[PDB]
Design an enzyme around this catalytic site. Structure first.
Site, short mmCIF file in Angstrom:
data_model
loop_
_atom_site.label_atom_id
_atom_site.label_comp_id
_atom_site.label_asym_id
_atom_site.label_seq_id
_atom_site.Cartn_x
_atom_site.Cartn_y
_atom_site.Cartn_z
N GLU A 96 0.69 -1.36 -0.06
CA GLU A 96 -0.11 0.23 -0.09
C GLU A 96 1.03 1.42 -0.11
O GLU A 96 2.05 1.04 0.21
CB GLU A 96 -1.01 0.03 1.14
CG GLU A 96 -0.35 -0.29 2.58
CD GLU A 96 -0.33 -1.74 2.90
OE1 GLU A 96 -1.09 -2.75 2.07
OE2 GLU A 96 0.23 -2.16 3.70
N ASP A 141 18.13 17.35 -37.87
CA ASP A 141 18.49 18.18 -38.97
C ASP A 141 20.06 18.63 -38.79
O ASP A 141 20.48 18.63 -37.60
CB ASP A 141 17.65 19.29 -39.47
CG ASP A 141 17.88 19.70 -40.88
OD1 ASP A 141 19.09 20.06 -41.27
OD2 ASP A 141 16.86 19.74 -41.63
N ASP A 163 12.24 22.80 -36.22
CA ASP A 163 11.78 23.82 -36.02
C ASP A 163 11.02 24.73 -37.08
O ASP A 163 11.03 25.73 -37.21
CB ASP A 163 12.78 24.98 -35.30
CG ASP A 163 13.91 24.70 -36.05
OD1 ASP A 163 14.26 23.84 -36.83
OD2 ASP A 163 14.58 25.86 -36.08
N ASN A 191 9.15 -11.29 4.23
CA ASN A 191 8.45 -11.22 5.63
C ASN A 191 7.27 -12.11 5.83
O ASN A 191 7.07 -12.95 6.78
CB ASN A 191 8.00 -9.75 5.86
CG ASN A 191 9.14 -9.02 6.02
OD1 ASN A 191 10.32 -9.22 5.86
ND2 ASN A 191 8.94 -7.67 6.54
N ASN A 219 4.42 -1.05 6.75
CA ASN A 219 4.41 -0.86 5.40
C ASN A 219 4.22 0.88 5.01
O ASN A 219 4.84 1.29 4.38
CB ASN A 219 3.42 -1.57 4.69
CG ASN A 219 3.77 -2.98 4.70
OD1 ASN A 219 4.75 -3.27 5.32
ND2 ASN A 219 2.98 -3.77 3.76
N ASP A 277 6.84 3.14 3.14
CA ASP A 277 6.64 3.82 2.07
C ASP A 277 6.73 5.14 1.95
O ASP A 277 7.21 5.86 1.07
CB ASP A 277 5.11 3.57 1.53
CG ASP A 277 5.15 1.69 0.83
OD1 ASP A 277 5.42 0.93 1.55
OD2 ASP A 277 4.55 1.94 -0.17
MG LIG Z 1 11.61 -7.54 6.55
#
Ligand SMILES: [Mg+2]
Length: 889
Positions: A298, A340, A617, A685, A710, A714
């Protein structure tokens, strides 16, 4: 059925404009804009469908990761809020996971709003402007999208037509309607009242439609139709823009599918084991919920959005203002850069100009006619015209035969430049007269196209007839000058068109060739440094130009480019698709091409298993830019390029493009790094949980504990976008992948599970018993029993964080960390601060509220040793993975 208004505007005249005609100071335009916006329409870009937010959110909330989060909330509901025992009704997870679902869905909707297909100004960072004159101040450059029916826009050299517009003022207006009708030769438009309903709409000598870029001239016009009602709208209705390029959406969905597979394999196994052995099926459901929460990473879309925003901002800061977010992926996969020679490889400032006679000697008359042709030109002024003007103005004080020609002569007619004819013409005449016959027709252009037009020569002391010997002599001298590095243009002059009209290509014939003008565009100071860097990073710099081969070869050799078998457009016509693909894959310098030959070259190169990026261009190079996979252009360019481009550059330099490519690559590198690391750690884990489910009489960590772990990991991984990336990963164009992620999970995962089991035993036998006695003697419901469980959970909490966050400094690089590849300072600081935060959490009121506890001081040195042991085992497995599966990440 919209043709009624267009035909009404084409017929009648400015005297029958019910929607106002006079304006810019008196037109009642301060609140009629709303009436026109609603009643008539607005300048939109609706391609095939514009399903509202009602369906946009519906399709954005069925994303697989959102589905996983929703099912996590549902299982948390179906276990922790209803089917639990009476009194055990504690939602917590329900709301805390619904918040994650919403935070993922909102960010995904924001991304998909700014995610489109190739050229799209969804970000609206840089845009294209129109010179409007509204009834407040006037002369206000506004975005093309902010155009309504009943407005006036002045059309000048290079200005794209804002919307379906009716001409009101016309001064030598030539517009290229080839973007929608073909016939690349510019079409002349005039302001009149002719009806002539019998027409294919294409001609419409009175109407200028959207997308008809103005080649040359000055013209004011009133808007008669806007939005998808324009023919550009019906052309965009045929979308045909779907592509099979794997982008961020597919990669994220594939990662979610890998997570789904691992969950569908592991969770049923844990449930079966616990329900069949422990006899506690509700505890089995709790184990399954914990495994599903841990495996699912998450706060992943937040990291993805952070990476994308950081990449876009950094690319913009590196003089590379990007467009719709998919520009990063498209450009980062560029194998071939088809550009070019004008500007990119040469400093356009001409420092060596020469006015040469037919023999090769200096003669100012040629410079005089060149100044007359340049200063009285309504088209785009290139480097040659500017150099002519500046040199003439600098030398006017010495020899007044060049004496100021700006006022002594007045333009009366003009012929634009066509790539077919390679010659631009102006009819100029003295305003004060004095001779009653002066209507010179100076024409400047290429070599062979000009020679095939002229019939007599000049210089010497006489107007000698155009002998074929003289033609060959002039061509050979021109070739010598071109191979000397200087590009040459030839000028011609005719006189006495007494009626000042009829100026067509037929009148652009039978002239007197005064001489030729030579200019040198010196190569840029970036002496192949950018070219070599692009080659190192995986970009093959190929040149697509229409000029002479000699000057192109000279410049390319000066910038270390391969001067070799150079394919000309004449060969390209004869070479079929297969052989053209072969020579294009082999050759790198293509000279004397056409606007459509460049498009064919780009198309064949792309179809031959490559990605092409065209940098242009000009008005004509858009034909190849739209045929290119990633469109590149400079800010100081025409609108047909910027609208069709994706990588608009604030400066013209290949190093800017290279740095943009590098930043775009780093975005995906850091994204896939974070994805792999988080996925492998979560797999390790939860695999330790699965393998220890048959021994531990309690869940190793609560679902809230793993969820908080978590979340902290994160939110402490937001510095991954600002993480340094090894050059070995940034030198190869790369695309999104999921199989490497799965391999990383299944290989560098269990090495954490082993030490997770080690920490399990060290908690169940060395520390928790040390604080509460042997667990067997502990009676359920006692303070000691709950304390043992809480201390075990907190110990695994702290150890898991200390291993997951500190391993990033090791698995980031496939080399020896801190010796060859250092990490980023923000990454290290955020890692340390997050680790301190988690370590301080269980010593506060948040602990004993989620279920944590203060840990004994003897527990810390065991972690100090365990982290280092994990680092060493991770390094061993990392070298194994690098030498087995090719690359680590
Ligand atoms: Mg771990």
């Amino acid at each position: 059925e919209i043709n009624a208004r267009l035909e009404f505007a084409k017929t009648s005249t400015k005297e029958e404009l019910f929607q106002k005609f006079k304006t810019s100071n008196k037109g009642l335009s301060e609140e009629q804009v709303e009436i026109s916006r609603e009643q008539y329409g607005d300048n939109t870009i609706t391609r095939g469908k514009k399903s509202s937010l009602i369906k946009r959110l519906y399709q954005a909330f069925i994303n697989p990761f959102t589905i996983i989060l929703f099912v996590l909330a549902l299982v948390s509901a179906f276990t922790d809020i209803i089917l639990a025992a009476p009194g055990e009704k504690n939602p917590q997870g329900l709301i805390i996971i619904t918040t994650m679902v919403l935070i993922s869905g909102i960010l995904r909707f924001v991304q998909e709003t700014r995610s489109g297909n190739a050229a799209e100004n969804l970000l609206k960072m840089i845009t294209t402007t129109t010179n409007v004159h509204r009834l407040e101040s006037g002369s206000q450059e506004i975005p093309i999208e902010e155009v309504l029916v009943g407005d006036i826009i002045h059309l000048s050299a290079g200005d794209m037509v804002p919307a379906d517009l009716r001409i009101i003022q016309a001064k030598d207006l030539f517009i290229s309607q080839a973007s929608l009708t073909g016939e690349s030769e510019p079409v002349e438009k005039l302001d009149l009242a002719t009806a002539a309903a019998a027409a294919s709409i294409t001609e419409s000598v009175n109407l200028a439609f959207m997308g008809s870029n103005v080649i040359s001239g000055s013209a004011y016009g009133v808007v008669i139709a806007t939005g998808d009602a324009t023919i550009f709208g019906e052309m965009a209705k045929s979308v045909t823009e779907d592509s099979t390029k794997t982008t961020f959406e597919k990669g994220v969905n594939s990662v979610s599918w890998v997570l789904i597979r691992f969950m569908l394999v592991m969770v049923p196994f844990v449930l079966l084991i616990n329900g069949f052995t422990k006899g506690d099926w509700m505890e089995a459901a709790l184990f399954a919920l914990a495994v599903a929460v841990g495996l699912t990473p998450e706060m992943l879309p937040m990291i993805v959005t952070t990476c994308l925003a950081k990449g876009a901002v950094t690319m913009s800061k590196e003089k590379t203002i990007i467009k719709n977010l998919n520009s990063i992926q498209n450009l980062g996969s560029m194998n071939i850069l088809c550009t070019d020679k004008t500007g990119t490889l040469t400093q356009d400032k001409v420092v060596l100009m020469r006015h040469l006679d037919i023999h090769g000697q200096e003669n100012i008359r040629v410079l005089r006619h060149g100044f007359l042709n340049s200063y009285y030109q309504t088209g785009l002024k290139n480097l040659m015209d500017l150099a002519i003007i500046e040199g003439a103005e600098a030398k006017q004080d010495k020899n007044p035969e060049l004496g100021g020609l700006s006022s002594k002569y007045t333009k009366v007619d003009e012929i634009p430049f066509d790539f077919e004819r390679r010659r631009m013409s102006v009819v100029v005449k003295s305003n004060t007269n004095g001779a009653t016959s002066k209507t010179q027709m100076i024409t400047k252009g290429a070599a062979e196209e000009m020679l095939d037009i002229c019939t007599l020569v000049e210089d010497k002391g006489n107007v000698v007839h155009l002998t074929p010997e003289l033609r060959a002599y002039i061509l050979k001298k021109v070739d010598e000058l071109n191979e000397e590095g200087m590009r040459v243009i030839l000028v011609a002059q005719k006189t006495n068109p007494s009626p000042i009209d009829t100026f067509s290509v037929q009148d652009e014939s039978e002239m007197v060739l005064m001489g030729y003008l030579a200019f040198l565009d010196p190569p840029k100071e970036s002496t192949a440094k950018a070219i070599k860097a692009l080659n190192k990073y995986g970009v093959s710099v190929k040149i697509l130009t229409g000029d002479n081969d000699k000057v192109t070869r000279s410049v390319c050799k000066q910038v270390g480019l391969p001067v070799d078998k150079t394919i000309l457009g004449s060969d390209i016509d004869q070479l079929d698709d297969n052989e053209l693909a072969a020579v294009a894959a082999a050759a790198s310098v293509f000279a004397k091409l056409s606007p459509q030959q460049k498009a064919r070259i780009v198309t064949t190169l792309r179809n031959s298993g490559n990605s092409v990026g065209y940098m242009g261009d000009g008005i004509n190079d858009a034909a190849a830019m739209k045929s290119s996979d990633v469109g590149i252009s400079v800010d100081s360019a025409v609108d047909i390029a910027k609208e069709s481009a994706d990588v608009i550059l604030l400066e013209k330099d290949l190093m800017v493009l290279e740095k943009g490519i590098i930043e775009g690559r780093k975005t995906y590198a850091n994204m896939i790094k974070y994805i792999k690391m988080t996925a492998s750690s979560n797999f390790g884990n939860m695999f330790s949980v699965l393998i220890a489910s048959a021994f531990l009489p309690f869940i190793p960590m609560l679902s809230i504990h793993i969820l908080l772990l978590n979340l902290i990991y994160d939110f402490s991984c937001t510095a991954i976008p600002w993480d340094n990336v090894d050059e070995e990963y940034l030198v190869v164009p790369r695309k999104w992948d999921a199989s490497s992620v799965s391999k990383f999970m299944l290989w560098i995962g269990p090495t954490s599970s082993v030490f997770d089991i080690t920490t399990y035993l060290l908690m169940f036998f060395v520390i928790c018993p040390a604080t509460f006695g042997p667990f067997s003697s502990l009676v359920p419901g006692s303070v000691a029993y709950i304390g043992f469980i809480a201390l075990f959970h907190t110990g695994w909490f702290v150890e898991s964080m200390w291993t997951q966050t500190l391993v990033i400094h090791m698995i980031r690089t496939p080399k020896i960390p801190f010796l060859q590849s250092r990490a980023s300072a923000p990454l290290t600081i955020l890692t340390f601060m997050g680790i301190i935060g988690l370590t301080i959490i269980p010593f506060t009121s948040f602990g004993h509220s989620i279920g944590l506890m203060a840990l004994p001081i003897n527990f810390f040195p065991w972690l100090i040793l365990t982290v280092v042991m994990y680092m060493m085992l991770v390094t061993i497995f990392k070298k194994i993975f690098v030498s087995k599966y090719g690359e680590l990440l």
